[PDB]
RNA sequence: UAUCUGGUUGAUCCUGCCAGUAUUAUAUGCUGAUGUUAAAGAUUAAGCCAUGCAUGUGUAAGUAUAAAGACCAAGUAGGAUGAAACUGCGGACGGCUCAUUAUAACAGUAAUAGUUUCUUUGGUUACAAGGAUAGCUUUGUGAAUGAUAAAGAUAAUACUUGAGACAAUUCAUUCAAGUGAGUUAGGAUGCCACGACAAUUGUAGACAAGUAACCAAUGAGAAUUUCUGAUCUAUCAAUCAGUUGGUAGUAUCGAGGACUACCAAGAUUAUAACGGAUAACGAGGAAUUGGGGUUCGACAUCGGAGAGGGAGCUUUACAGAUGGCUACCACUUCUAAGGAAGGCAGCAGGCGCGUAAAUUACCCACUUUCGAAUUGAAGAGGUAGUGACGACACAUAUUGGAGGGCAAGUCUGGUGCCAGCAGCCGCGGUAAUUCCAGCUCCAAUAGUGUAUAUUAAAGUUGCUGUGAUUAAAACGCUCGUAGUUGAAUUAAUUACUUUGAAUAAAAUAAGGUGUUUAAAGCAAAACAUUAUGUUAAUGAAUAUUCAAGCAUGGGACAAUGC
RNA sequence: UGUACACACCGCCCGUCGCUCCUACCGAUUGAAUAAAGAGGUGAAAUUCUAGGAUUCUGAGAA
């Protein structure tokens, strides 16, 4: 969806979630005015050893 | 200045507060387009005055000036896509001949009344404000929405 | 003054509002080496900028051209 | 102002960084080192903005303190290390190498490189003086001090460096038939061929340079940086190849 | 403290200069140290940026160079006989640059014996008189209030006549 | 002096001739800080001490009710109108009032005999709403 | 929108002002459905402060038998981790305010061949020694402070000595190449002082790590300095004696009357010196403008100065530091009466002052700074609360007025030159179009009146651009210096003009982009139905821009040529 | 023909004196108060130099 950034330095994959209506972290989600489309940004922290290490 | 953001005005009050010639002329535009108050007329006059000033500035320059070619084409392109200026008139001199009626005839309220979705220009305002009319993919509740030519045939009910 | 002269520069200052120039002048205290012995008052002098050599003397005479006389030949 | 300044307000940051004016009240002040404050791109700026590997200063530290970024051949752990000119930038975890090059829009752009061409670098000599003991040395625009050089290595030339060993591979004379990439004022990122070099006794040397498309412009000798000899470049230029589209083309190509 | 700024002076036009700031360390001066003649007494002064200046309060010995013979020897200072700036420096035996002083040419004489095989007690006539009288004339060329030592040279032909006639 | 290099006299003439502007000189010379009971302030506060009535000019007839006010900032004594109908009965004594100008007319204005100030508050809200 | 209208008269044409008008920005009256954005104790008092917080910092890598290690865990040089303490670094950045300040500061510009640290970066130059000190133990004083006394031990990357073998300073003489230009970087001779690359640290994350000097970068940085540029005032016309220069020295990081000794009489001024005022920090900029202009700028950002008033200093690379110290003046607080600390022009808040200005909130998650460092702090910063200062979009009701200027009533009830209205002309003496009310409609509208001030109107401050016979205004007349202006004419600078170089952003203009439009933001996506790709995607060329400075083509009009 | 009258010469209008109010000037009073420069007197304090060596460290020297 949208764009992919492969980020092995942070052991991470990040996407721009485009909703057409533990390793998962979701942030910055807001809908469009008048319902329907909702957008957001997702955080693929794969192994559960980065999530803790690389997570506030 | 104290704020790092930017704030700009959109309308100006007239110089002479009381004239009978101006009062009835504004009322003709209000009745023909169903405007809330004279602040909506003044925004159109301000918006028109800006483009008129731009065209007037470059008309005094030489025809082949690179400054005129860059700004003149950009001003005309913005006018064409907004639908205000018909595509045949591709000369800057036609911007000075524009009137406040041309801009007012491109508000979403006017189009949805002309397109027949509403019975009256006042019914168009109520229909727009009720989240009942969609332009392409996103619903709109602001009747001052100036529709482009590409979004002109994309108006339909909710 | 000894080994020192005062150089006057006459220039024109442009006043934007009236679109007209006005005559101004400034005095620069410069150091005159004893190499220029024929240097008197009224001569045309080319000066260059050096390190501060006094409280006000911050220039040095590089060349000079003699000019008309005024019955007062005040040499350096 | 009793001493050195440690903060840098966002609005005072160099323009070609393009820091958003509402993002915050501060900008990352680049720590001293090889390159000047306004001729450098801090390492945090490269990762967070130009590459999006990190989303904030917190995550830039995790990347750099993991010992995963190599500037030149060495590995730097300073979040505000000043990366300036063609100084190479290697990320071995992602197996990619970039070179910080200019472009016609007066900006720092990352030019991708191959592994074999990321092992070399071009440095511009700045001065050549006799050290103590009659030992000559050269100072490069990077800031490197290099011991006994070739006697022909004069002040304004360019040399090729072997990053793994630090030796000198190739040197290009600063003459009137060699390619140059400007690094200073309005010519920032422009590439052409030197055609005239006029000197004024007092103030400056002004160089006339002819662009590959026949355009001509002028710059100060300070901003000249020789890339190669005889219109042939030793480094791979950016996408625009040092050619400035004169306004109208750039506006029209952005419309399309 | 003593200041070296120009904000306390007057303009070239003679007009008084008004005050906007206060005294600052950048324009700070220090009390002069009049290096007299006597037992060795030096002090270390922390200057700006941490550097150290050797403030010589009192000295007796010094290194003096003979230009003609291309030698430099350590020598005890006897008297100060001429100061071109202030005569009060002569009585107090203050050691400053350009102060013509009198030193005993004992090491120089011994060096001449070992090198030529002769004794001094062509050279300018007044130089010989200083050798036989035991007091030769030398000029201090260091800044004892800054470097903490007296480095000088033995006066010679044209400089000797000018300074000898002054006495 | 209409010449190209005659900018000294042209600029110096406007400096001298500008001092003859009655409206401009008054706002520049040092009188707004010494001869103005109000001062630069738009409004001022004071204590009512006496209720006065001033007869109007010759072509008019009647008594203009007004009050005498002692300002706080300076301590001067002034006279202040009492706007619309029957507003003097609302004004008590030894209380704080807000005094605020008038237009300026030919200097004096609307209670005729030299009054130039109008009471806009009575401690309270308004010698309007009141 | 390059705009005017009422008022001198029986009436007319003028000069001319008063008033009206619009816009900003400060206060205030009345009033108020929302969403976005947003100023907010500057003006008066840089006046005074209760209370709370605003500067601290530990990794494997300086020192830790804490009698700390039931908590991982075991333990003969100390097992990972480790409170407090010594040592190192920092509190000189950031935050607040505008009192001082008139060529001072600041802006552009140029120099440092006249100075230069800290941090960071690139280089270069004995099989291991000596004491004592804190935290620790013990005994204590004082009402008390971030109060302090003795003794007994114990470590170093704390303090020293010491092999490992040059560098840098001063002086004297000398051989001399880049640079526009240097007895210049540099070499040689002799001498003095100084003198090294821890007598250092991880078993674990040879590799590290650390340390002293010296080169160079960082450094178009800091600091001094060059040229040009400021508001009003002549009821301020003469000012200056370290003042102006010279020599020698002193001091400083360094030039320099910065200071000292001797010498000479110089320096500035009608092109406005020296004075006086400012309700004066400078600039980028802001408000309003057809063009020209006028007014403002305490406050985003850059530069300067200050911490109640001066003054004097300590530490250090950087301070004349005040969330450091000492003394004097004026205050404030505790007290056991002996004594003691404290500086909100830091964030909240309180008193006072004034027309005039908000919570004694939560958190380091954003930006970034400091630190022994991926982790800790940060009233910097962010979020929240008050908020008709303002700006934008948007529902269905208030504010002012109804004689003219000026859109709107020759409607009805009271009032009777009274009360009053009235910015100006004026209306009111009983039949008021103007008072007080009722009804109606006039303007704007979630805004609308009032008061003060800026701008336009004002061609009523004039360069564009005024008037001088009679409206105000040609010296009584002539001579005259500075100043201003100067006939025609010819086949080295300056000025003028054209292009540039170089020059912080924000702001202004302007390019793109459906924040649902818009004010905004500089991002998001248009389509690829998008990981793939346009893509190494956008950063408007973003242009300015005056007065100086640098370069370039031309020499008509001009000045000094000589 | 002149006019400063237009309620139109029963017009208009000038100055002194008497009453009330307001603004500013001179004025004996070595008037008074506040603020800032100048000279001089006394002069804390910290730095620089000089004398001192209580103490403590080595077995006279150093601090």
DSSP for E83-108, please give it: ESS-THHHHHT---TTEEEEE--HHH
Experiment used for this model: cryo-EM
Distance CA F76, CA A49 (A): 80
User: Of C26, C32, C27, C25, whose CA–CA distance to C46 is shortest?
Assistant: C32
Distance CA D212, CA D200 (A): 27
Residue nearest to nucleotide G116 (CA to C1'): E49
- Could you give the 3-state DSSP secondary structure of residue E19? coil
Task: For the sheet with B138-139, list strands across it.
Answer: B138-139, B133-135, B155-157
- Could you give the 3-state DSSP secondary structure of residue D253? helix
CA F2 / C1′ G487 distance in Å: 21
User: Of B155, B65, B75, whose CA–CA distance to B107 is shortest?
Assistant: B155
**Residue D125 structure tokens:** 């000599």
Question: What's the burial of D124, exposed, middle or buried (CB within 10 Å: 0-12/13-18/19+)?
Answer: buried
Query: Which nucleotides of strand G lie under 7 Å from a protein CB?
Result: 1, 3, 18-23, 26-30, 37-40, 91-95, 100-105, 110-111, 113-114, 116-124, 167-173, 177-180, 185-187, 189-193, 214-230, 232-233, 239-240, 242-261, 264, 266-275, 277, 279, 284-286, 292-294, 299-307, 310-313, 315-322, 353-356, 365-370, 373-375, 380-382, 390-396, 406-408, 417-424, 426-429, 435-437, 442-446, 450-454, 460-464, 483-486, 495-496, 500-512, 514-523, 525, 528, 530-533, 536, 538-542, 546-548, 550-551, 561-562
What's the gap between Cα C35 and its chain centre? Answer: 17
- C29 CB within 8 Å of a chain E CB: yes
User: Of D169, D118, D154, D124, whose CA–CA distance to D142 is shortest?
Assistant: D124
Closest nucleotide C1' to the C-alpha of D55 = G366
User: Of B58, B88, B61, B63, whose CA–CA distance to B74 is shortest?
Assistant: B58
Residue B151 CB partners (closer than 8 Å, separation 6+): B135, B136
Distance CA D21, CA D10 (A): 7
**Residue B2 structure tokens:** 């104290």
Residue F36 CB partners (closer than 8 Å, separation 6+): none
Whether F and B touch (3+ CB pairs < 8 Å), yes or no: no
Quote the crossing angle between the two packed helices E157-165 and E125-133, to the nearest 10°: 70
CA F56 / C1′ G420 distance in Å: 12
Distance CA D181, CA D187 (A): 8
Q: Return the H-helix or E-strand segment holding B65.
A: none
Q: How many residues does chain B have?
A: 158
Distance CA B21, CA B23 (A): 6
What's the gap between Cα B57 and its chain centre? Answer: 21
Distance CA D164, CA D116 (A): 12
Closest nucleotide C1' to the C-alpha of E30 = G251
User: Of F37, F30, F120, F115, whose CA–CA distance to F74 is shortest?
Assistant: F37
User: Of D228, D227, D205, whose CA–CA distance to D218 is shortest?
Assistant: D205
Q: Which residues of chain E between 27 and 56 are close to nucleic strand H, CB under 7 A?
A: 31, 33, 41, 43, 55
Q: What Å distances lie between residue E30 and E25, E46, E141, CA to CA?
A: 11, 11, 22
- C35 CB within 8 Å of a chain F CB: no
**Residue B140 structure tokens:** 């709109």
Q: How many residues does chain D have?
A: 256
Residues of A in contact with B137 (CB under 8 A): 37
Question: What's the burial of D83, exposed, middle or buried (CB within 10 Å: 0-12/13-18/19+)?
Answer: buried
CA C57 / C1′ G226 distance in Å: 11
DSSP, res E9: S
Whether E and B touch (3+ CB pairs < 8 Å), yes or no: no
Q: What Å distances lie between residue D174 and D126, D152, D158, E27, CA to CA?
A: 12, 11, 7, 45
- Could you give the 3-state DSSP secondary structure of residue D43? helix
The CB density around residue E155, as the number of other CB atoms within 10 Å, is 22
User: Of E102, E104, E107, E166, whose CA–CA distance to E132 is shortest?
Assistant: E104
Phi-psi region of E78 (alpha: psi -120 to 50; beta: other; left: phi over 0): alpha
User: Which residue of A3, A4, A10, A42 is the best one to mutate when testing the D interface, meaning the one whose CB has the most D CBs within 10 A?
Assistant: A10
Place of tokens 């957008």: A39
The answer to whether F37 CB sits below 7 Å from nucleic acid chain G is: no
Distance CA F107, CA F104 (A): 5
Distance CA B94, CA B82 (A): 15
Residue F54 CB partners (closer than 8 Å, separation 6+): F63, F64, F66, F79, F111, F112, F113, F115
The answer to whether residues F1 and C20 touch, using CB atoms and an 8 Å cutoff, is: no
Residues of F in contact with C25 (CB under 8 A): none
**Residue B60 structure tokens:** 């005094």
Nearest-CA distance B80 → chain D (Å)? 15
Report angle CA C63, C69, C72 to the nearest 5 degrees.
100
Query: Which nucleotides of strand H lie under 7 Å from a protein CB?
Result: 47-50
- A30 CB within 8 Å of a chain D CB: no
* Three-class DSSP labels, A23-55: CEEEEEEEECCCCCEEEEEEEECCCCCHHHHCC
The answer to whether residues E58 and E37 touch, using CB atoms and an 8 Å cutoff, is: yes
Residue D54 CB partners (closer than 8 Å, separation 6+): A10, D47, D48, D60, D62, D63
Nearest-CA distance D248 → chain B (Å)? 7
Question: Does D59 contact A5 at a Cβ distance shorter than 8 Å?
Answer: no
User: Of D230, D25, D192, D175, whose CA–CA distance to D104 is shortest?
Assistant: D192
The answer to whether residues A13 and A5 touch, using CB atoms and an 8 Å cutoff, is: yes
* Max Cα–Cα distance, chain D, nearest Å: 64
**Residue F21 structure tokens:** 């502007």
The CB density around residue C47, as the number of other CB atoms within 10 Å, is 19
Distance CA B48, CA B41 (A): 11
DSSP, res B146: B
Question: What's the burial of D242, exposed, middle or buried (CB within 10 Å: 0-12/13-18/19+)?
Answer: buried
Dihedral, CA of residue E107, residue E111, residue E113 and residue E114, to nearest 10: 140
Distance CA B85, CA D131 (A): 74
Distance CA D47, CA D53 (A): 6
DSSP track, F7-43: -HHHHHHHHHHGGG-HHHHHTTSTTTTTS-SSTT-SS
Nearest-CA distance D14 → chain B (Å)? 18
DSSP track, F58-96: TT--SEEEEEEEEESSS--EEEEE--STT-STT--SS-E
Distance CA B137, CA D243 (A): 41
Whether D and F touch (3+ CB pairs < 8 Å), yes or no: no
Report angle CA F118, F124, F126 to the nearest 5 degrees.
45
What's the gap between Cα E109 and its chain centre? Answer: 23
E65-101 per-residue burial string, b: 16 or more CB within 10 A, e: under 16: ebeeeeeebebebbebbbbeeeeebeeebbbbbebbb
Report angle CA F118, F120, F125 to the nearest 5 degrees.
165
The answer to whether E69 CB sits below 7 Å from nucleic acid chain G is: no
The answer to whether E16 CB sits below 7 Å from nucleic acid chain H is: no
Q: What Å distances lie between residue F71 and B72, D67, F76, F78, F124, CA to CA?
A: 63, 75, 6, 8, 17
The answer to whether residues E109 and E123 touch, using CB atoms and an 8 Å cutoff, is: no
Beta strands in chain B (DSSP E): 133-135, 138-139, 155-157
Distance CA E100, CA E153 (A): 10
Nearest-CA distance D109 → chain A (Å)? 19
Whether C and A touch (3+ CB pairs < 8 Å), yes or no: no
Residues of A in contact with D79 (CB under 8 A): none
**Residue B37 structure tokens:** 């108050």
Question: What's the burial of C53, exposed, middle or buried (CB within 10 Å: 0-12/13-18/19+)?
Answer: middle
User: Which residue of D46, D55, D68, D77 is the best one to mutate when testing the A interface, meaning the one whose CB has the most A CBs within 10 A?
Assistant: D55
The answer to whether residues D103 and D109 touch, using CB atoms and an 8 Å cutoff, is: yes
Task: Give the torsion sign (CA, F54, F56, F61, F67).
Answer: negative
Q: What Å distances lie between residue B19 and A1, B3, B13, CA to CA?
A: 61, 38, 13
Quote the crossing angle between the two packed helices B66-82 and B38-59, to the nearest 10°: 150
Distance CA F118, CA E107 (A): 104
Q: Show which subunits contact D, needing at least 3 CB pairs below 8 angstroms.
A: A, B
Distance CA C10, CA B67 (A): 41
Nearest-CA distance B125 → chain A (Å)? 17
What's the gap between Cα F109 and its chain centre? Answer: 10
The answer to whether residues A33 and B138 touch, using CB atoms and an 8 Å cutoff, is: yes
Residues of F in contact with C21 (CB under 8 A): 4-5, 7
Q: B131: number of CA atoms within 13 Å, CB side?
A: 5
Nearest-CA distance C55 → chain E (Å)? 9
Place of tokens 């506006």: D251
Distance CA A53, CA A9 (A): 12
Residues of F in contact with C12 (CB under 8 A): 5
DSSP, res D26: B
Q: What is the CA radius of gyration of chain C?
A: 15
Residue C24 CB partners (closer than 8 Å, separation 6+): C10, C11, C12, C13
Residues of B in contact with D21 (CB under 8 A): 4
User: Of F23, F45, F26, F48, whose CA–CA distance to F35 is shortest?
Assistant: F26
User: What is the structure's resolution, reported in angstroms to one decimal?
Assistant: 3.1
Place of tokens 């019955």: C71
CA D131 / C1′ G168 distance in Å: 14
- C22 CB within 8 Å of a chain F CB: yes
The answer to whether residues A51 and A13 touch, using CB atoms and an 8 Å cutoff, is: no
Enumerate the β-bridge partners of residue F63: F55
């Amino acid at each position: 969806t949208r764009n992919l950034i492969v980020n092995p330095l942070l052991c991470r994959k990040q996407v721009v979630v485009d909703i057409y209506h533990q390793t998962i972290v979701l942030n910055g989600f807001v809908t469009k005015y008048g319902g329907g489309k909702t957008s957001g940004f997702a955080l693929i922290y794969d192994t559960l050893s980065a999530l803790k290490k690389f997570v506030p | 200045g104290r704020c790092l953001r930017n704030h700009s005005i959109t309308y100006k009050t007239p110089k002479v507060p009381y004239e009978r010639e101006r009062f009835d002329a504004e009322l003709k535009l209000v009745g023909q387009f169903g405007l809330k108050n004279k602040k909506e007329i003044q925004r159109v006059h301000y918006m028109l005055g800006h483009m008129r000033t731009i065209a007037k500035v470059m008309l005094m320059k030489d025809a082949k000036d690179p400054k005129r070619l860059l700004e003149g084409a950009a001003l005309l392109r913005r006018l064409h896509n907004l639908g205000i200026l018909p595509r045949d008139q591709n000369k800057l001199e036609f911007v000075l001949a524009l009137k406040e009626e041309n801009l007012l005839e491109r508000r979403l309220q006017t189009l949805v009344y002309r397109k027949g979705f509403a019975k009256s220009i006042h019914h168009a305002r109520v229909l727009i404000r009720g989240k009942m009319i969609k332009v392409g993919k996103q619903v709109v509740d602001v009747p001052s929405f100036l529709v482009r030519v590409e979004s002109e045939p994309l108006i339909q009910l909710a | 003054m000894k080994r020192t002269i005062i150089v006057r520069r006459d220039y024109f200052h442009y006043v934007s509002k009236y679109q007209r120039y006005e005559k101004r002048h400034k005095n620069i205290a410069v150091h005159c080496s004893p190499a220029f012995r024929q240097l008197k008052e009224g001569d045309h002098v080319v000066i260059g900028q050096c390190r501060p050599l006094s409280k006000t003397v911050r220039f040095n005479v590089l060349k000079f051209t003699s000019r008309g006389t005024g019955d007062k030949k005040q040499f350096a | 102002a009793r001493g050195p300044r440690h903060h840098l307000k966002r609005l005072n940051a160099p323009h070609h960084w393009m820091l958003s004016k509402l993002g915050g009240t501060f900008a990352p002040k680049p720590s001293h080192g090889p390159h000047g404050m306004k001729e450098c791109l801090p390492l945090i700026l490269i990762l967070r903005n130009r590459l999006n590997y990190a989303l904030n200063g917190r995550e830039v530290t995790m990347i750099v303190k993991n010992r995963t970024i190599k500037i030149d051949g060495k590995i730097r752990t300073d979040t505000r290390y000043p990366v300036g000119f063609m100084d190479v930038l290697s990320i071995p975890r992602t197996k990619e190498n970039f070179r910080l090059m200019y472009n016609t829009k007066r900006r720092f752009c990352l030019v991708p490189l191959t592994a074999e061409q990321a092992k070399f670098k071009l440095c511009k000599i700045e001065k050549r003086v006799l050290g103590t003991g009659a030992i000559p040395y050269i100072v490069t625009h990077d800031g490197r001090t290099i011991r006994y050089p070739h006697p022909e290595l004069q002040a304004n030339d360019t040399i090729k460096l072997n990053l793994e060993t630090g030796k000198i591979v190739d040197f290009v004379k600063f003459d009137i038939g060699n390619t140059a990439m400007m690094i200073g004022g309005n010519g920032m990122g422009r590439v052409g061929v030197i055609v005239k070099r006029e000197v004024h006794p007092g103030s400056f040397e002004i160089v006339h340079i002819k662009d590959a498309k026949g355009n001509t412009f002028t710059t100060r000798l300070n901003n000249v940086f020789v890339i190669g000899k005889g219109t042939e470049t030793l480094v791979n230029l950016p996408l625009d190849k040092g050619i400035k589209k004169p306004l109208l083309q750039q506006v029209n190509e952005t419309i399309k | 403290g003593i200041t070296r700024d120009s904000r306390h002076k007057r303009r070239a036009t003679g007009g008084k200069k008004n005050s906007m700031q206060k005294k600052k360390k950048n324009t700070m001066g220090r009390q002069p140290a009049n290096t007299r003649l006597g037992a060795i007494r030096v002090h270390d002064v922390r200057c700006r940026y941490g550097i150290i200046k050797r403030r010589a309060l009192r000295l007796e010995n010094g290194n003096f160079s003979w230009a003609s013979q291309s030698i430099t020897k350590g020598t005890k200072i006897l008297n100060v006989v001429y100061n071109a700036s202030d005569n009060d420096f002569v009585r107090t035996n203050t050691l400053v640059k350009g102060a013509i002083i009198e030193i005993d040419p004992a090491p120089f004489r011994l060096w001449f014996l070992k090198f030529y095989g002769k004794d001094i007690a062509k050279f300018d006539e007044a130089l010989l008189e200083g050798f036989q009288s035991g007091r030769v004339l030398a000029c201090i060329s260091s800044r004892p209030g800054q470097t903490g030592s007296v480095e000088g040279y033995i006066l010679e032909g044209k400089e000797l006549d000018f300074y000898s006639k002054k006495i | 002096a209409r010449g190209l290099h005659a900018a000294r006299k042209m600029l110096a003439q406007r400096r001298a001739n500008k001092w003859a502007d009655k409206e401009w000189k008054k706002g520049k010379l040092v009188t707004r800080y010494k001869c103005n009971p109000l001062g630069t302030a738009s409004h001022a506060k004071g204590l009512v001490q006496e209720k006065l009535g001033i007869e109007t000019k010759q072509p008019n007839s009647g008594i203009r009710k007004c009050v005498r006010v002692r300002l706080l900032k300076n301590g001067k004594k002034i006279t202040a109108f009492v706007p619309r109908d029957g507003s003097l009965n609302y004004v008590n004594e030894n209380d704080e009032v807000l005094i605020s100008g008038f237009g300026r007319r030919g200097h004096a204005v609307g209670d005729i005999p030299g009054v130039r100030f109008k009471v806009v508050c009575v401690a309270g809200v308004s010698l309007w709403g009141l």
